Amino acid sequence: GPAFEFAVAMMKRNSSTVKTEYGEFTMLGIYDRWAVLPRHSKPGPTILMNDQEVGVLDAKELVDKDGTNLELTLLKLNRNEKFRDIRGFLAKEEVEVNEAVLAINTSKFPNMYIPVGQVTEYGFLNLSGKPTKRMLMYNFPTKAGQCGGVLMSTGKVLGIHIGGNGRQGFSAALLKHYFN
Numbered sequence: 001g002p003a004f005e006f007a008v009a010m011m012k013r014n015s016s017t018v019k020t021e022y023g024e025f026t027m028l029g030i031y032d033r034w035a036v037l038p039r040h041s042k043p044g045p046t047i048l049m050n051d052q053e054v055g056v057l058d059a060k061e062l063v064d065k066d067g068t069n070l071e072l073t074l075l076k077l078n079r080n081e082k083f084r085d086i087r088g089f090l091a092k093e094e095v096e097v098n099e100a101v102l103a104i105n106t107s108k109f110p111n112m113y114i115p116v117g118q119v120t121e122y123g124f125l126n127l128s129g130k131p132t133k134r135m136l137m138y139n140f141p142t143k144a145g146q147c148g149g150v151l152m153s154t155g156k157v158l159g160i161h162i163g164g165n166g167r168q169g170f171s172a173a174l175l176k177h178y179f180n
């Protein structure tokens with residue numbers, strides 16, 4: 001419903017299409033010149049943000065208090081424009097909704113929205129060796145390259161799509177304290 005209406009504006013305002021040595025991803029700007037990517041996108045010194053070279057001043061691969069992986073990488077971008085501060089839409093702890101929307105903006109999947117249904121606090125996952133935490137699960141046969149689409153609901157940004165097993169698809173929960 002207004003889930004979609006909410007999501008198009010988010011992607012219009014704060015999203016971009018990023019390419020790295022590891023493939024094409026969806027990127028979400030959080031505030032200032034900070035954005036998030038799936039950790040496994042492994043951005044180096046620069047990245048292709050909507051086909052232009054934007055430099056990456058700093059990058060923190062995010063982890064637990066236990067050091068456990070969280071599959072989130074924070075990017076300070078070297079560009080003038082500030083993003084819109086969407087931290088007000090981020091939860092303090094993982095969120096479960098019955099109706100949720102996954103949104104991708106890559107060249108393979110340009111500007112597409114998916115009524116993905118029910119998100120549940122899946123918690124732990126061993127993702128190709130890498131044990132990662134605070135996962136959100138949904139029953140949709142996602143694929144490459146839909147990382148790292150954005151998981152939303154009415155006025156919530158829930159997480160960032162980082163993996164899938166061909167039947168379910170998983171998102172790294174996107175919490176407030178990840179950003180001061």
Ligand SMILES: N#C[C@H](O)[C@H](C[C@@H]1CCCNC1=O)NC(=O)[C@H](Cc1ccccc1)NC(=O)/C=C/c1ccccc1
Pocket residue numbers: 040071126127128130132141142143144145146147148162163164165166169170
């Ligand atoms: N685009 C894009 C992403 O690279 C892609 C989306 C996947 C692909 C598969 C099919 N379903 C999806 O959505 N994610 C990926 O490719 C991630 C990358 C990753 C590597 C290491 C740690 C965490 C994440 N990997 C996976 O999703 C596969 C993990 C897995 C496989 C078998 C059994 C249990 C877990």
